[PDB]
Coordinates of C-alpha atoms (C1' of nucleotides) and ligand atoms in Angstrom, one line a residue:
Chain A
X1 CA 26.9 28.0 -25.5
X2 CA 25.4 28.6 -22.0
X3 CA 28.0 31.2 -20.8
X4 CA 26.4 34.4 -22.1
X5 CA 28.0 37.9 -21.7
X6 CA 25.9 40.3 -19.7
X7 CA 27.9 43.4 -20.5
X8 CA 25.8 46.2 -22.0
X9 CA 25.1 45.7 -25.8
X10 CA 27.1 42.5 -26.0
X11 CA 25.5 39.4 -27.5
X12 CA 28.4 36.9 -27.2
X13 CA 27.9 33.4 -25.8
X14 CA 30.5 30.8 -25.1
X15 CA 30.8 27.1 -24.6
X16 CA 33.4 27.5 -21.8
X17 CA 33.5 29.7 -18.7
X18 CA 37.2 30.5 -19.1
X19 CA 36.5 31.7 -22.6
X20 CA 33.7 34.0 -21.4
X21 CA 36.1 35.4 -18.7
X22 CA 38.9 35.9 -21.3
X23 CA 36.4 37.7 -23.6
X24 CA 35.2 40.0 -20.8
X25 CA 38.7 41.5 -20.5
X26 CA 37.9 43.3 -23.7
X27 CA 35.1 45.2 -21.9
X28 CA 37.0 45.9 -18.7
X29 CA 40.5 46.5 -20.1
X30 CA 42.0 44.2 -17.6
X31 CA 45.5 43.1 -18.5
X32 CA 46.7 40.4 -16.1
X33 CA 49.9 39.4 -17.8
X34 CA 53.1 41.4 -17.7
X35 CA 56.3 41.3 -19.8
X36 CA 59.3 41.1 -17.4
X37 CA 61.6 42.8 -20.0
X38 CA 59.6 45.9 -21.0
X39 CA 56.8 45.9 -18.4
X40 CA 54.0 46.1 -21.0
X41 CA 50.8 44.4 -19.9
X42 CA 48.6 42.0 -21.9
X43 CA 45.1 40.6 -21.8
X44 CA 46.2 37.0 -22.5
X45 CA 49.0 34.8 -21.4
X46 CA 49.6 33.2 -24.8
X47 CA 50.0 36.7 -26.4
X48 CA 52.5 37.7 -23.6
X49 CA 54.4 34.6 -24.5
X50 CA 54.7 35.4 -28.2
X51 CA 55.4 39.1 -27.4
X52 CA 58.4 38.1 -25.4
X53 CA 60.0 36.7 -28.6
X54 CA 60.2 40.3 -29.9
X55 CA 62.9 40.8 -27.3
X56 CA 64.8 37.5 -27.5
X57 CA 65.0 37.2 -31.3
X58 CA 63.9 33.5 -31.2
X59 CA 62.4 32.5 -34.5
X60 CA 61.3 28.9 -34.1
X61 CA 59.3 28.5 -37.3
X62 CA 61.5 27.8 -40.3
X63 CA 60.5 27.8 -44.0
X64 CA 60.5 24.3 -45.4
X65 CA 60.9 25.4 -49.0
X66 CA 64.1 24.2 -50.6
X67 CA 67.0 26.7 -50.3
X68 CA 64.9 29.2 -48.4
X69 CA 66.3 30.1 -45.0
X70 CA 63.6 32.4 -43.7
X71 CA 62.5 31.9 -40.1
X72 CA 59.6 33.4 -38.0
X73 CA 58.7 34.1 -34.4
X74 CA 55.1 32.9 -34.8
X75 CA 53.5 30.0 -36.6
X76 CA 51.0 32.2 -38.5
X77 CA 53.8 34.3 -40.0
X78 CA 55.2 31.0 -41.4
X79 CA 51.7 30.1 -42.7
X80 CA 51.6 33.4 -44.5
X81 CA 55.1 32.9 -45.9
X82 CA 54.4 29.3 -47.2
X83 CA 51.2 30.6 -48.8
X84 CA 53.4 33.0 -50.7
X85 CA 55.9 30.5 -52.1
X86 CA 53.1 28.8 -53.9
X87 CA 51.5 32.1 -55.1
Chain B
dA1 C1' 56.8 42.5 -42.8
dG2 C1' 56.2 42.0 -37.6
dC3 C1' 53.2 41.7 -34.3
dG4 C1' 48.8 43.3 -31.3
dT5 C1' 44.9 40.8 -30.0
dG6 C1' 40.4 38.7 -30.9
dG7 C1' 37.8 33.5 -31.5
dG8 C1' 38.2 28.5 -31.2
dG9 C1' 40.3 23.8 -30.0
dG10 C1' 42.8 20.8 -26.9
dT11 C1' 45.3 18.9 -22.5
Chain C
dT1 C1' 42.0 27.1 -12.8
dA2 C1' 46.6 26.7 -15.8
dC3 C1' 49.1 26.2 -20.3
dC4 C1' 49.7 24.4 -25.1
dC5 C1' 48.4 26.1 -29.4
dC6 C1' 46.1 27.3 -34.5
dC7 C1' 43.5 30.6 -37.2
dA8 C1' 42.3 35.1 -38.3
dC9 C1' 41.8 40.2 -38.9
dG10 C1' 44.1 44.3 -38.7
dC11 C1' 47.5 48.1 -38.6
Ligands
LIG1 ZN1 30.9 40.6 -24.0
LIG2 ZN1 58.1 43.2 -23.6
LIG3 ZN1 60.5 30.5 -47.7

DNA sequence: AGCGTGGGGGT
DNA sequence: TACCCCCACGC
């Protein structure tokens, strides 16, 4: 982890320079990525992408439990739901 | 529940 | 650099 953060009081280090740069957006508040539907801005392009599904209704991630028809916008929502079917 | 927004991995 | 994500914590 040679890419250290020099912002005041921060101790984080990273293996990649792009991951240090992404991290530093927390300190500066920079939000490079904008939703073309509602104009909200986001720190990260992947989170803009999943945000956009809140407008389109697309729910790609389907429960695989027999006779359950629930679907989800994001993979981790489906992880949480599968965890629940088991208990 | 639905989703904001970190870290970490890959290509 | 640009995207593709999973995992995770939190409200
Ligand atoms: Zn920092
Ligand atoms: Zn939007
Ligand atoms: Zn289900």
